[PDB]
Enzyme design. Structure first.
Site, PDB file in Angstrom:
ATOM      1  N   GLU A 127       0.801  -1.231   0.000  1.00  0.00           N
ATOM      2  CA  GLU A 127       0.000   0.000   0.000  1.00  0.00           C
ATOM      3  C   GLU A 127       0.840   1.292   0.000  1.00  0.00           C
ATOM      4  O   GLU A 127       0.524   2.266   0.676  1.00  0.00           O
ATOM      5  CB  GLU A 127      -1.017  -0.020   1.152  1.00  0.00           C
ATOM      6  CG  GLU A 127      -1.992  -1.184   1.021  1.00  0.00           C
ATOM      7  CD  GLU A 127      -3.047  -1.243   2.107  1.00  0.00           C
ATOM      8  OE1 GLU A 127      -3.112  -0.314   2.952  1.00  0.00           O
ATOM      9  OE2 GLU A 127      -3.832  -2.246   2.114  1.00  0.00           O
ATOM     10  N   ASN A 179       2.424  -5.263  -2.863  1.00  0.00           N
ATOM     11  CA  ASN A 179       0.975  -5.526  -2.733  1.00  0.00           C
ATOM     12  C   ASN A 179       0.185  -4.234  -2.613  1.00  0.00           C
ATOM     13  O   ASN A 179       0.643  -3.285  -2.004  1.00  0.00           O
ATOM     14  CB  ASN A 179       0.767  -6.401  -1.479  1.00  0.00           C
ATOM     15  CG  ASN A 179      -0.614  -7.068  -1.412  1.00  0.00           C
ATOM     16  OD1 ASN A 179      -1.111  -7.605  -2.391  1.00  0.00           O
ATOM     17  ND2 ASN A 179      -1.216  -7.048  -0.216  1.00  0.00           N
ATOM     18  N   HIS A 215     -10.068  -6.726  -3.315  1.00  0.00           N
ATOM     19  CA  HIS A 215     -11.268  -6.492  -2.520  1.00  0.00           C
ATOM     20  C   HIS A 215     -12.334  -5.838  -3.395  1.00  0.00           C
ATOM     21  O   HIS A 215     -12.435  -4.617  -3.477  1.00  0.00           O
ATOM     22  CB  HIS A 215     -10.940  -5.582  -1.330  1.00  0.00           C
ATOM     23  CG  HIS A 215     -10.001  -6.202  -0.344  1.00  0.00           C
ATOM     24  ND1 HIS A 215     -10.344  -7.324   0.394  1.00  0.00           N
ATOM     25  CD2 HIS A 215      -8.740  -5.869   0.034  1.00  0.00           C
ATOM     26  CE1 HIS A 215      -9.328  -7.648   1.186  1.00  0.00           C
ATOM     27  NE2 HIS A 215      -8.346  -6.777   0.992  1.00  0.00           N
ATOM     28  N   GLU A 246      -5.821 -11.101  -1.395  1.00  0.00           N
ATOM     29  CA  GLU A 246      -6.833 -10.830  -0.364  1.00  0.00           C
ATOM     30  C   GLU A 246      -8.260 -10.836  -0.908  1.00  0.00           C
ATOM     31  O   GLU A 246      -9.076 -10.005  -0.531  1.00  0.00           O
ATOM     32  CB  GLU A 246      -6.543  -9.500   0.365  1.00  0.00           C
ATOM     33  CG  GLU A 246      -5.101  -9.317   0.794  1.00  0.00           C
ATOM     34  CD  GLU A 246      -4.841  -8.078   1.616  1.00  0.00           C
ATOM     35  OE1 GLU A 246      -5.808  -7.404   2.018  1.00  0.00           O
ATOM     36  OE2 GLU A 246      -3.647  -7.755   1.824  1.00  0.00           O
ATOM     37  N   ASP A 248     -11.984 -11.073  -1.729  1.00  0.00           N
ATOM     38  CA  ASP A 248     -13.289 -11.196  -1.135  1.00  0.00           C
ATOM     39  C   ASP A 248     -14.261 -10.390  -1.996  1.00  0.00           C
ATOM     40  O   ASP A 248     -13.846  -9.547  -2.796  1.00  0.00           O
ATOM     41  CB  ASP A 248     -13.347 -10.843   0.365  1.00  0.00           C
ATOM     42  CG  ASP A 248     -12.662  -9.554   0.733  1.00  0.00           C
ATOM     43  OD1 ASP A 248     -12.606  -8.607  -0.097  1.00  0.00           O
ATOM     44  OD2 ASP A 248     -12.154  -9.405   1.881  1.00  0.00           O
TER      45      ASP A 248
END
Ligand SMILES: [Ca+2]
Length: 346
Positions: A127, A179, A215, A246, A248
């Site tokens: 990030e 990432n 996400h 990650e 979802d």
């Protein structure tokens, strides 16, 4: 289970901080991990501050999880060596610390070396890109970079280069990832990712791959945009790996200007709703896009961000209920699970 259907890691984020999701207490979750996955990411307990107790390094709790993984058929993705959020900054990571660069070096050298041979891959930097949605201090963009304490102390993005070089030196065997989130949108942040990664390649930095957190919501961003964003990064290098870190999938989209297509009650999708069926298709199309555009030999893995819906960080979000993961509250596989199966199997 799922991991049997692929020749790259199929992973899951695991909790270890108490409550119902804690992997050490929940035999049902232990059983799902062993049956379905072959990698874990620590959801929380490998963040930066967790490597310390008082002033000293402390690996006790993270060693317990890494050992559990090795005993139960899982590799480990380390999350994360360098990340800005103040809830997980070590106390040394402050503009008030004259020793910052030395303590930064000590952190990466010590943590990467400690886990050598036990942790397959790392989020080395997480990030680093500016995000308007995620700038609570109002610092603003520096040509697309987040002005975190690491950026401020180093006077620019050179902290990223240094973190990769130190991680490589400390553990030559680990796969090293950059990432980030929202980079699958194929908009301004994707462009900033291109700039970031190109600069590292131009500088000869030992980056092995790029992680997409992924996400996403059921209908946004478009699969065409997700696919093109990944393509843009794959095109930067003939060897750079791509990892979905990650994943979802939120049924609800509170940002669409439509408050009449929201599920507002926990009972809405407890058994069956159009959203769970779309969620199957959504998991499926994302896994398919990954396979289509990330070559064999460059597939770093796909990881979902938790085991069961009530464990998810997005079980509630924007004051609404959601159902983001592959297993429901009673730990039963959802249509989402089948979407992954169908994709991985062709
Ligand atoms: Ca909506």
């Amino acid at each position: 289970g799922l991991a049997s259907l692929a020749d790259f890691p199929i992973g899951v984020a695991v909790a270890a901080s108490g409550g119902n999701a804690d992997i050490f207490t929940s035999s049902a979750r232990q059983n799902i991990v062993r049956a379905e996955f072959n990698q874990i990411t620590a959801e929380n307990i490998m963040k930066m501050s967790y490597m310390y107790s008082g002033s000293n390094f402390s690996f006790t709790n993270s060693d317990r999880l890494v050992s559990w993984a090795a005993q139960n058929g899982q590799t480990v993705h380390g999350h994360a060596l360098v990340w800005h959020p103040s809830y997980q900054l070590p106390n040394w990571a402050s503009d008030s610390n004259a020793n910052f660069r030395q303590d930064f070096a000590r952190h990466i050298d010590t943590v990467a070396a400690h886990f050598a041979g036990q942790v397959k891959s790392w989020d080395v930097v997480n990030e680093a890109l500016f995000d308007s949605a995620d700038d609570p201090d109002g610092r603003g963009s520096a040509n697309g970079y987040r002005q975190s304490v690491f950026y401020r102390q180093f006077g620019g993005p050179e902290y990223i280069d240094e973190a990769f070089r130190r991680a490589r030196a400390a553990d030559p065997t680990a796969e090293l990832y950059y990432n980030d989130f929202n980079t699958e949108e194929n908009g301004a942040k994707t462009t900033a990712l291109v700039n970031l990664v190109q600069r590292l390649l131009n500088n000869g930095v030992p980056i092995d791959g790029v992680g997409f957190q992924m996400h996403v919501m059921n209908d946004y961003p478009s699969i065409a945009n997700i696919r093109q964003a990944m393509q843009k990064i794959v095109a930067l290098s003939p060897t750079l790996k791509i990892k979905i870190t990650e994943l979802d999938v939120r049924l609800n989209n509170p940002y669409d200007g439509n408050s009449s297509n929201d599920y507002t009650n926990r009972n809405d999708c407890a058994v069956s709703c159009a959203g769970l069926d779309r969620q199957k298709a959504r998991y499926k199309e994302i896994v398919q896009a990954y396979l289509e555009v990330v070559p064999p030999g460059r597939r770093g893995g796909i990881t979902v961000w938790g085991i069961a819906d009530p464990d998810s960080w997005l079980y509630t979000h924007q004051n609404l209920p959601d159902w983001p993961l592959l297993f429901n509250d009673n730990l039963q596989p959802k249509p989402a699970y089948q979407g992954v199966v169908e994709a991985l199997s062709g």
